[PDB]
Amino acid sequence: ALVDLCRRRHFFSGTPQQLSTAALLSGCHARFGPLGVELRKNLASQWWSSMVVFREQVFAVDSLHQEPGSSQPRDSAFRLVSPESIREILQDREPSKEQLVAFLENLLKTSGKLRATLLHGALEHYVNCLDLVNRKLPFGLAQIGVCFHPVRVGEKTEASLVWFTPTRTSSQWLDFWLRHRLLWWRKFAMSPSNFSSADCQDELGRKGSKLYYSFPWGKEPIETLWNLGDQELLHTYPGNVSTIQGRDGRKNVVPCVLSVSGDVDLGTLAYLYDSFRKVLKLHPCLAPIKVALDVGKGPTVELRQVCQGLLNELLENGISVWPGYSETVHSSLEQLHSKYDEMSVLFSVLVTETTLENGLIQLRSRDTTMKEMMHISKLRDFLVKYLASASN
Amino acid sequence: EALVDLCRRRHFFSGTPQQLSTAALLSGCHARFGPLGVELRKNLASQWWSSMVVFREQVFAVDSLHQEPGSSQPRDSAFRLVSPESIREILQDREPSKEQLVAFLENLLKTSGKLRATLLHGALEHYVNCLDLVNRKLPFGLAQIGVCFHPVTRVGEKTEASLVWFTPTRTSSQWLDFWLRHRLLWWRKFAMSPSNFSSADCQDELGRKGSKLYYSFPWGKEPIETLWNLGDQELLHTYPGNVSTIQGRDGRKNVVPCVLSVSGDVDLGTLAYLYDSFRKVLKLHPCLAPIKVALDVGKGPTVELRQVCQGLLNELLENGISVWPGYSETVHSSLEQLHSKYDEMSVLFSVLVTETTLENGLIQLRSRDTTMKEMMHISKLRDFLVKYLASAS
Amino acid sequence: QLRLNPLLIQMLSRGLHEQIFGCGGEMPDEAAVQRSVEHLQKHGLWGQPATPLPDVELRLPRLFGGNLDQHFRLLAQKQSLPYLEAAASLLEAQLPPEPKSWAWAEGWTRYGPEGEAEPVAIPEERALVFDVEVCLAEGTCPTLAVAISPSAWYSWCSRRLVEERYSWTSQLSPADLIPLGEQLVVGHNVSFDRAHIREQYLIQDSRMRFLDTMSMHMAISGLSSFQRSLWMGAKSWDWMDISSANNLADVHNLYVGGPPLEKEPRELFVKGSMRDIRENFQDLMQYCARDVWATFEVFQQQLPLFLERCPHPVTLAGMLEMGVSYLPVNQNWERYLTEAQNTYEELQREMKKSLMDLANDACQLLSGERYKEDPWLWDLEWDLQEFKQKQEDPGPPSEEEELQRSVTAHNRLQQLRSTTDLLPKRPQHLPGHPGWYRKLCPRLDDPAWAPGPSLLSLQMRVTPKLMALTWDGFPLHYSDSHGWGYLVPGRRDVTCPYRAIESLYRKHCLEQGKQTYHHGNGPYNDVNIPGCWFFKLPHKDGNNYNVGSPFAKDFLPKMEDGTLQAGPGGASGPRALEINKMISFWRNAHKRISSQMVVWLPRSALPRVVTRHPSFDEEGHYGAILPQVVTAGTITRRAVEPTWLTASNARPDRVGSELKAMVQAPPGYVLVGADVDSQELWIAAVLGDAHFAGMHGCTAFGWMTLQGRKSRGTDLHSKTAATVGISREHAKIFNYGRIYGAGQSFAERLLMQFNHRLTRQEAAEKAQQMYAVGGTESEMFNKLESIAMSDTPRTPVLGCCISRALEPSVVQGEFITSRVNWVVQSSAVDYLHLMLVAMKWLFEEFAIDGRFCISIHDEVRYLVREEDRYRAALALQITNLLTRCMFAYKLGLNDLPQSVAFFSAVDIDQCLRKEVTMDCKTPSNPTGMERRYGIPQGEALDIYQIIELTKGSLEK
DNA sequence: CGGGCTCCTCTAGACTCGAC
DNA sequence: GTCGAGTCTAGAGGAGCT
Numbered sequence A: 001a002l003v004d005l006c007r008r009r010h011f012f013s014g015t016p017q018q019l020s021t022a023a024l025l026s027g028c029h030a031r032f033g034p035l036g037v038e039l040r041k042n043l044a045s046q047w048w049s050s051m052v053v054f055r056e057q058v059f060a061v062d063s064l065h066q067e068p069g070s071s072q073p074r075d076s077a078f079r080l081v082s083p084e085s086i087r088e089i090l091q092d093r094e095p096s097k098e099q100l101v102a103f104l105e106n107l108l109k110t111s112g113k114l115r116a117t118l119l120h121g122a123l124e125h126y127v128n129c130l131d132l133v134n135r136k137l138p139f140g141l142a143q144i145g146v147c148f149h150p151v152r153v154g155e156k157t158e159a160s161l162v163w164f165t166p167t168r169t170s171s172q173w174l175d176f177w178l179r180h181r182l183l184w185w186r187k188f189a190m191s192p193s194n195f196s197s198a199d200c201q202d203e204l205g206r207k208g209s210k211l212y213y214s215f216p217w218g219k220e221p222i223e224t225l226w227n228l229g230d231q232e233l234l235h236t237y238p239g240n241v242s243t244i245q246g247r248d249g250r251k252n253v254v255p256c257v258l259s260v261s262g263d264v265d266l267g268t269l270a271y272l273y274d275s276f277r278k279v280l281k282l283h284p285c286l287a288p289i290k291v292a293l294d295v296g297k298g299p300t301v302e303l304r305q306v307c308q309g310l311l312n313e314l315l316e317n318g319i320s321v322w323p324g325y326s327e328t329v330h331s332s333l334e335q336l337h338s339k340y341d342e343m344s345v346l347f348s349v350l351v352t353e354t355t356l357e358n359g360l361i362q363l364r365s366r367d368t369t370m371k372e373m374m375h376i377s378k379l380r381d382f383l384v385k386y387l388a389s390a391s392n
Numbered sequence B: 001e002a003l004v005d006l007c008r009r010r011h012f013f014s015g016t017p018q019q020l021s022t023a024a025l026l027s028g029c030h031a032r033f034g035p036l037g038v039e040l041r042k043n044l045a046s047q048w049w050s051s052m053v054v055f056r057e058q059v060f061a062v063d064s065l066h067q068e069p070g071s072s073q074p075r076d077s078a079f080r081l082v083s084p085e086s087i088r089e090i091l092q093d094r095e096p097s098k099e100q101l102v103a104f105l106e107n108l109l110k111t112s113g114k115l116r117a118t119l120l121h122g123a124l125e126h127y128v129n130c131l132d133l134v135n136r137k138l139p140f141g142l143a144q145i146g147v148c149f150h151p152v153t154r155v156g157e158k159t160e161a162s163l164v165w166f167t168p169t170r171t172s173s174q175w176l177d178f179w180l181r182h183r184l185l186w187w188r189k190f191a192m193s194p195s196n197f198s199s200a201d202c203q204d205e206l207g208r209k210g211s212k213l214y215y216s217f218p219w220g221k222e223p224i225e226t227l228w229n230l231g232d233q234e235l236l237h238t239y240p241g242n243v244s245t246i247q248g249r250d251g252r253k254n255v256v257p258c259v260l261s262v263s264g265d266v267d268l269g270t271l272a273y274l275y276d277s278f279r280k281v282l283k284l285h286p287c288l289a290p291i292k293v294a295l296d297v298g299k300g301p302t303v304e305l306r307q308v309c310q311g312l313l314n315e316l317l318e319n320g321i322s323v324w325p326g327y328s329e330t331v332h333s334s335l336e337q338l339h340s341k342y343d344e345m346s347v348l349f350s351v352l353v354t355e356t357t358l359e360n361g362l363i364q365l366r367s368r369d370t371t372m373k374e375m376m377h378i379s380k381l382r383d384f385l386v387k388y389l390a391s392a393s
Numbered sequence C: 001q002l003r004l005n006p007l008l009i010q011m012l013s014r015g016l017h018e019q020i021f022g023c024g025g026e027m028p029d030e031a032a033v034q035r036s037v038e039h040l041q042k043h044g045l046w047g048q049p050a051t052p053l054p055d056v057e058l059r060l061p062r063l064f065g066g067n068l069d070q071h072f073r074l075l076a077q078k079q080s081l082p083y084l085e086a087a088a089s090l091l092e093a094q095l096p097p098e099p100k101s102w103a104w105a106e107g108w109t110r111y112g113p114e115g116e117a118e119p120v121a122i123p124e125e126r127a128l129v130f131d132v133e134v135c136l137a138e139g140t141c142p143t144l145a146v147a148i149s150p151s152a153w154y155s156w157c158s159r160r161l162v163e164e165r166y167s168w169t170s171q172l173s174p175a176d177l178i179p180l181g182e183q184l185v186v187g188h189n190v191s192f193d194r195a196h197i198r199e200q201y202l203i204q205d206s207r208m209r210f211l212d213t214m215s216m217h218m219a220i221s222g223l224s225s226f227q228r229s230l231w232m233g234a235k236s237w238d239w240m241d242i243s244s245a246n247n248l249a250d251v252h253n254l255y256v257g258g259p260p261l262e263k264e265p266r267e268l269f270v271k272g273s274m275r276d277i278r279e280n281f282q283d284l285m286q287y288c289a290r291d292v293w294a295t296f297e298v299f300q301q302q303l304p305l306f307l308e309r310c311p312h313p314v315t316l317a318g319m320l321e322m323g324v325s326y327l328p329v330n331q332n333w334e335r336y337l338t339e340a341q342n343t344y345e346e347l348q349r350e351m352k353k354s355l356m357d358l359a360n361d362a363c364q365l366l367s368g369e370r371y372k373e374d375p376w377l378w379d380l381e382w383d384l385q386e387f388k389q390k391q392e393d394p395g396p397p398s399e400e401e402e403l404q405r406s407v408t409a410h411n412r413l414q415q416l417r418s419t420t421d422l423l424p425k426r427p428q429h430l431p432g433h434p435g436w437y438r439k440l441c442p443r444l445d446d447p448a449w450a451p452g453p454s455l456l457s458l459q460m461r462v463t464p465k466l467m468a469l470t471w472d473g474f475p476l477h478y479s480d481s482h483g484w485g486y487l488v489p490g491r492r493d494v495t496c497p498y499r500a501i502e503s504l505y506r507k508h509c510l511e512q513g514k515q516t517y518h519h520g521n522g523p524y525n526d527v528n529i530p531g532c533w534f535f536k537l538p539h540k541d542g543n544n545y546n547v548g549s550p551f552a553k554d555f556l557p558k559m560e561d562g563t564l565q566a567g568p569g570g571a572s573g574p575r576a577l578e579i580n581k582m583i584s585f586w587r588n589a590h591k592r593i594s595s596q597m598v599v600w601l602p603r604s605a606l607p608r609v610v611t612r613h614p615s616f617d618e619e620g621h622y623g624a625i626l627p628q629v630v631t632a633g634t635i636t637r638r639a640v641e642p643t644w645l646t647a648s649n650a651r652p653d654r655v656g657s658e659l660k661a662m663v664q665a666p667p668g669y670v671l672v673g674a675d676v677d678s679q680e681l682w683i684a685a686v687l688g689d690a691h692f693a694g695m696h697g698c699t700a701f702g703w704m705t706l707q708g709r710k711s712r713g714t715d716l717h718s719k720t721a722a723t724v725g726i727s728r729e730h731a732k733i734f735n736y737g738r739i740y741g742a743g744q745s746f747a748e749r750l751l752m753q754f755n756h757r758l759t760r761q762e763a764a765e766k767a768q769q770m771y772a773v774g775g776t777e778s779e780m781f782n783k784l785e786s787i788a789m790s791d792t793p794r795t796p797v798l799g800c801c802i803s804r805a806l807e808p809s810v811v812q813g814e815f816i817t818s819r820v821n822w823v824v825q826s827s828a829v830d831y832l833h834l835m836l837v838a839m840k841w842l843f844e845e846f847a848i849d850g851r852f853c854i855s856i857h858d859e860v861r862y863l864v865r866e867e868d869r870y871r872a873a874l875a876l877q878i879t880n881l882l883t884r885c886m887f888a889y890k891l892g893l894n895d896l897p898q899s900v901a902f903f904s905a906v907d908i909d910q911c912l913r914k915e916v917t918m919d920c921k922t923p924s925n926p927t928g929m930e931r932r933y934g935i936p937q938g939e940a941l942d943i944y945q946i947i948e949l950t951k952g953s954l955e956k
Numbered sequence D: 001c002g003g004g005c006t007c008c009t010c011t012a013g014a015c016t017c018g019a020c
Numbered sequence E: 001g002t003c004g005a006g007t008c009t010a011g012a013g014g015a016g017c018t
């Protein structure tokens, strides 16, 4: 199974009661180990550059994990209650039946609340980012952060794009974002047909698309699109509309708000399933370990010093390297290759006695399973080129 | 002009004027960073991650939930998590009694999730997995950058960069001194005034040895980092049971590892570096400045100049350099105002792609440090920027 | 066993005096005793009895000669007899001609007659002439060596010159050294060749000894530093024809003559690479053979002269013992180098951050030509250089539109990538920036390029202008003819902005509290700065000297007192000066210390004592550094070593100052040594005593020298220190300067430098009182001048003659101070030779496991096994007693005072340091040796403690 | 008339040679 | 034919030891 392999290779982390289909989608436990965290960080980096760096007028937003909290219904998100206050009321002076009802009313009425979606945080920063662009619509706000939803409390890491666009080109911008997100998901996928787009209608009748990933059990909405309109922005900014309307041409227009909400955690699960001898053929832009350095013969000290220099060079060049030469007990070469393939290691480098003589090292490629001899000085350039070619 | 006002108008900060006071900024009760501030914090977190995980032997990542298991602790001030539907269900629908309401409130303090205040507990939960990853070969470590909640009653959020180092008790003090020196050097590396970063040994309520780093803010020193020489008590509390699952291989003998916690405040660190950097110029470090290149245009032909600027942008972005497209701004401003704006935004370089570039390719490059204008060919700009960024590291 | 002098000085105990001088000594002359009393009471010194120090009873080993002189002659002959035989075998040996072709094989090749080459493991004979060539590009591993034997030529080739592998181990071992194993090796710098010998790094002391032709040249026809400078410039003046410089070519010209030697113009071993050496193998081997043959001829011409001018075998035995120095190190040495380099880099980065920020802030003075108004940066190069030459939202674009816009942008960008043709092949260096900023920045092509003015340092002449240093409210100004100084405004006779100087001075005087108004050093009118006077900064050596940098360590008190201030204010100036003071030693010695040739022994090479000892760590390294010592590098025949004789002691504010503390004995071994107390001062006293009345304490100076104790702080150095209120380490300099020729001006300047409270008049009065004193020190000076002015100046103890360039016939009245100081300094060198001979004799007879570690001009450190540390201490005390007795005997005094009979304390320590109790706190070692490296404090023991611990015996 | 050394960095000056 | 950049060397002032 894929979940067991990910757990043993530290892509996952949890008890067997937590590594189940229902539990994984819940988000009530830290389902990612160190390699899984690195893969999720690679996914976040690929999302960020493809949406905030390579895109025009898209800016970063950071918002709190707590919301002001209101007595409005249909809010199942867990609330914040001060522990000392509850101890003070229950102990010390004794309240009455009515007083405790008032205390519970106050908690519902006035208390913190855990955010359910990143949409509100971006909408709160609408004015500052509008002033950042000199009121020139359109512009977008992006954020990667953990959101809390009732299941216990589940945590899902969401990458949400709130795109402020004029009412005229709302459908065009929505289709633009839909095709761009579909290409982004399919860019890293060995099976890009497993990603699908379906037109969906909101409970208020608003239109959108739900990007799925065809998991082995069924499609899960890894990403959801909505044409929310001006309702949410008007709700979050009551009063004068002058601060709501942005400058688009000679007109001032309240921008329609588009929600592009992904699930980096569910996306990481999708890419782990897509990547799956036992080999996780993760895309080079996503694989957490890209070089594995090992020694092959004696002397240990000189070979270890050569490997240390090579590791320092690769780290200075931004390539993630697994120091496999530091293991006190090393397995066979075949076992190391199998372990690296299960861990989605792009390349394996073995430094031997011949390296001291001429600088030629045995380089192995995960995708082709073909050995190759390459000079030491030409390893770094080869890896950098390969990563650049895979990126573009 | 005050630093806070400048950082607010340049979008390093955020919030109303009632949130820009020193107490409000220190509390952490509101989002205090604009897009430039978020990018600066991301750069600081990336530098921390590099120096503490990438270039450090046997340091691994870990992610833990913001919510911790509920405990009936005597005086913990950690905010609790309750289901609003259940509160409505008890209060409304069937009517309970006075005693029942007491039982519910006691149950909240008894069995309810609590927001984390430190990253130590999350790191200790993944100790066995990292033991398996390293084949139980001490020393190793777990690093994590996340948000921790501090009661202030308002709730304050602070970004914490913590490295829980598991070392044998024999070299605990030596490793603690090494980490203290390493963190002090790391904080002084990006600082225009390394003297403002200090250290002071301190002890806790249980008498454990420790030290705290400080930054001399204009109002006073603040503990931007703490290093505690914790014992084995935390591991035993998190792992009550067989000692064979906690012991690590120190050399030839199994030893329950001594725990050192190196907790730094990334938000407070960004504030410290904003004060350290601050004509009005934020002399932030080149490895921390949010915007590294800024591009402009000339006086016609606009289409060809734009095409060239688009190509140069793409070239700079593909190499991993953040770029501010100042040419796309439809608002006209003089080069003096543009340069002052770039200075206040800690923009390292401002490129001027003019019509004369279409002839040869000479673009005027202005550096923030010297404010001097130097001509360079377009093909050489990317290599120069990469060399400058790799040399400032 | 208590004895007394006719002048009441406590002499040796009866048991020791009977075994040293013997009974039957002639009674003192009554007239001489009365004369000594009259001279001694004239200065109010007669009387004042001294407390009788506890007596000593030791059964010394038999002195198998006739007296002290004969005993030392016999010991030295026994020690240096076989090496003399090996040297004589070279002089009477005929050698086959230089082989036509040199073998390319690895190892040692022996050239027989007619150039035939044969593979041999090691040279067979005992006497060799050696020269070693090292490819400096690939580190310190030897490359090739050529040797001459009394019967054949020898050549050596390393595996790195032949095999040509990609990477070689950066840590050296005995395996990749030059194997050479009662053996003698001759060479111009035998120490450099010795440092490359495999067997020399073993803890066990191989009996191989090294005779150096440069040391013999210094002994025979040596030159002083002034004499060397004059001789090189010219390359009474007859000393030039009899002396030569230390270069092998000059020595060969002086002693042998004939065709001049030529060096290789390519210099492939220093500037070239390994491939060049492979290509030019035969040419380099021929040059090495030429050097070896010249060294052999020089040795032939030098050995009889050295034996005739130094007839005492003690001199040769002491040189042979000084040629086998040995310093042990461990894995902590690498940690020391890393930590020192890291601390140096951190402090230098902080200093460069400050300097670069100041420079960048200065570059904004181009706008408006405001740099012409800066009191400091007006004179820099602010010139510039020209660059040398030969709407509504359109909406989301579709996929094809995005592709077209991306490809059009690339194509436009790539089209210009070929317009580079119009630009010079050589890239200009920052034409936009000002010239002074350009000079501070490295060029983009440099392999060590760093952003900003990375080349800035406190030693540059622009740094004080950037920091805006003001001396008493006067900006600092540099005069090429007078060094650094400052400008005093108000004079009324790019132009210097004297108006800015006046404004700054007025602001400073109104702020700090100040009011022809300044006196200072002196107004030099040759500088001719418009509207300003140039006053030179006060220098620690006088007004004639020039100040090269106001960031010297002697300006730190002036920085603290507020006379010297920095422009930015605060602690910036004090921090800069404190960083300079903490980094100056490492800045000057980091290449020397880091590039020390450390050969790490494997565990097999280590003895069983090191491995079996509990302190042994299986994960630690064990090696040794062989210092490259010239046994006679001065006209006084002292040792010379570029680093270890210049190794700074541990200081609380000096990075890398724990250098000697890093010389740590291996487990099972300890370092036992001692320092001679008031060595040269007592030698001068005993000379003056033997010239006045022939008894200890006859002169007043000898009486002052003998009476006192160091522990109680009443010795002559301590007495002078208490009188003038300075440290004893500075009273040493004061007294030695007075002894060696310093006038009253030097005394005044030294007192003012070391005692800031004293004024000029107080220092002058103190100097004149201590120099006016028919004086106390008259007899010493008279005897020194009489020995110096003799037709054949020889050492009063061993008879070693002065260099032929310093004889009165050749030089008449010139360099007389050097020739009068030579008597005392060469007497100290004879003291060292006698100590080495006696220590070797005691170690050999009583079987003390140890060897000579290092000697620096008064010290004799020994790598003794821990089981025999106190035996070594007793042996060293006995050697001190015997050396003092030998001095007294050769000077005619047939007795020895008890005060100078023994060392104050013998230091038994695990590492080399000045004091046992020091933990060596240092910026690079902030926790100390015990916390970081685990070196405990040893023991400093006087004679009585050693007697108690060893039962007064050297045998076990 | 302090002496005996050691080495360093910085700077000025002269020499050499390629590109315009 | 000429200007500017390596490149090499020599001298001066500072700093370690004794």
Ligand SMILES: Nc1ccn([C@H]2C[C@H](O)[C@@H](COP(=O)(O)OP(=O)(O)OP(=O)(O)O)O2)c(=O)n1
Residues within 6 Å of the ligand: C675, C676, C677, C678, C679, C680, C681, C732, C733, C736, C737, C857, C858, E018
């Ligand atoms: N500035 C100095 C320092 C030293 N020396 C010479 C004279 C000493 O005899 C010898 C050793 O120097 P010390 O500093 O050890 O002088 P002492 O031997 O008197 O000191 P101590 O009594 O502590 O051994 O070097 C000198 O001429 N000038």
Ligand SMILES: [Ca+2]
Residues within 6 Å of the ligand: C675, C676, C677, C678, C679, C858
């Ligand atoms: Ca001494």
